[PDB]
């Protein structure tokens, strides 16, 4: 049963792209403890048209993380984060790290540091020393979260999904020292948290339309596609916050629940504006829309144009 796959090149080899796929042996649920694991290597011959099995290096734990890092491959098998190199017979592990809490579920590698995502614990920032081949964790989080997917937004800001239907974004402090040697000293503060309500498993920050602005497009397990766009103006963010505060009082949800309670299911809301609740201003009552526009000192077509401007700037 395969769980991870990666396609990159090795520093010891030439320009031949190798496809490494980690698999497990005798696994199922929590009652049936995982037995062993293996990592098959492919050649990607005919310019990526045919794959040839070069070697299959076994492992003691089930590998759930494979990512290239400075010409080598980072292999996370269970709670052991190991840096393996390309070998003629098997993948020679050049480094190893056993500082994981339960199991390494995901791994996103920056150009200088490495960010591994645990199963029940939040993702931690780890620096890899190239001189001594020793990976040292220099940052961690204060709140545990069942992370399913993550994406690096910047060199110090990382946004990760939650298994409970939430979305969080953690940013490292600027005074954090990467060169070092309850759990960790330096902690990472969560700058944004929002309960989306659906199980997110894919996050990607890119441009959906050429000429527009890049947004945090996220997927859902229920067949839904969403996008998170940052506010460019503080006055526009305050106007959107006032519009959301007016809409939470003027148009309640039909399920009898509170919007703030729905957004604060797993984690409290921090710098998040639900555009779907703001989109109901055109569908609500005209007298209530006129009252909300008089409270916002504008017109209802002006509010509709202000709502459509962000959608035209950030989406298709």
């Amino acid at each position: 049963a395969a769980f991870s796959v990666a396609v990159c090149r090795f520093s010891n080899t030439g320009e031949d792209w190798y496809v490494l796929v980690g698999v497990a042996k005798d696994l199922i649920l929590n009652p049936r403890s995982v037995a062993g694991g293996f990592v098959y290597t492919y050649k990607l011959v005919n310019n990526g048209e045919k794959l040839e099995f070069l070697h299959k290096t076994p492992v003691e734990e089930v590998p759930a993380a494979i990512a290239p890092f400075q010409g080598r491959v980072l292999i996370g098998v269970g709670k052991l984060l190991r840096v393996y190199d390309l070998g003629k017979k098997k993948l020679l592990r050049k480094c190893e790290n056993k500082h994981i809490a339960n199991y390494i579920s995901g791994i996103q590698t920056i150009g200088h540091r490495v960010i591994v995502s645990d199963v029940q614990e939040s993702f931690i920032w780890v620096r890899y020393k190239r001189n001594e081949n020793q990976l040292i964790i220099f940052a961690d989080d204060t709140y545990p979260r069942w992370v399913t997917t993550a994406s690096l937004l910047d060199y110090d800001t990382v946004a990760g999904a939650d298994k409970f239907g939430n979305i969080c974004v953690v940013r490292l402090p600027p005074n954090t020292n990467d060169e070092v040697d309850n759990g960790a000293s330096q902690k990472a503060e969560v700058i944004m948290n929002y309960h989306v309500g659906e199980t997110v498993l894919s996050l990607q920050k890119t441009t959906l339309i050429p000429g527009g602005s890049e947004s945090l497009v996220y997927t859902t397990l229920s067949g839904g596609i969403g996008i998170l766009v940052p506010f460019t103006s503080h006055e526009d963010h305050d106007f959107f916050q006032h519009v959301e505060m007016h809409l939470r009082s003027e148009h309640p949800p039909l399920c009898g629940r509170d919007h703030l309670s729905f957004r604060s299911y797993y984690f409290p809301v921090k710098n998040v504006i639900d555009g779907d609740l703001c989109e109901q201003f055109n569908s609500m009552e005209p007298n209530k829309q006129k009252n909300v526009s008089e409270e916002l000192d504008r017109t209802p077509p002006e509010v509709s144009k202000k709502l459509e401007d962000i959608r035209t700037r950030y989406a298709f």
């Binding site: 050429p210 000429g211 527009g212 602005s213 103006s233 526009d236 401007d309 700037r313």
Partner: peptide
């Protein structure tokens, strides 16, 4: 708001240009 609005219009300009590309 107004000053920003002037800027906002420019903001729109960029997206519109993007569409053209």
């Amino acid at each position: 708001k107004k000053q920003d609005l002037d800027d906002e219009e420019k903001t729109a300009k960029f997206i519109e240009e993007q569409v053209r590309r």
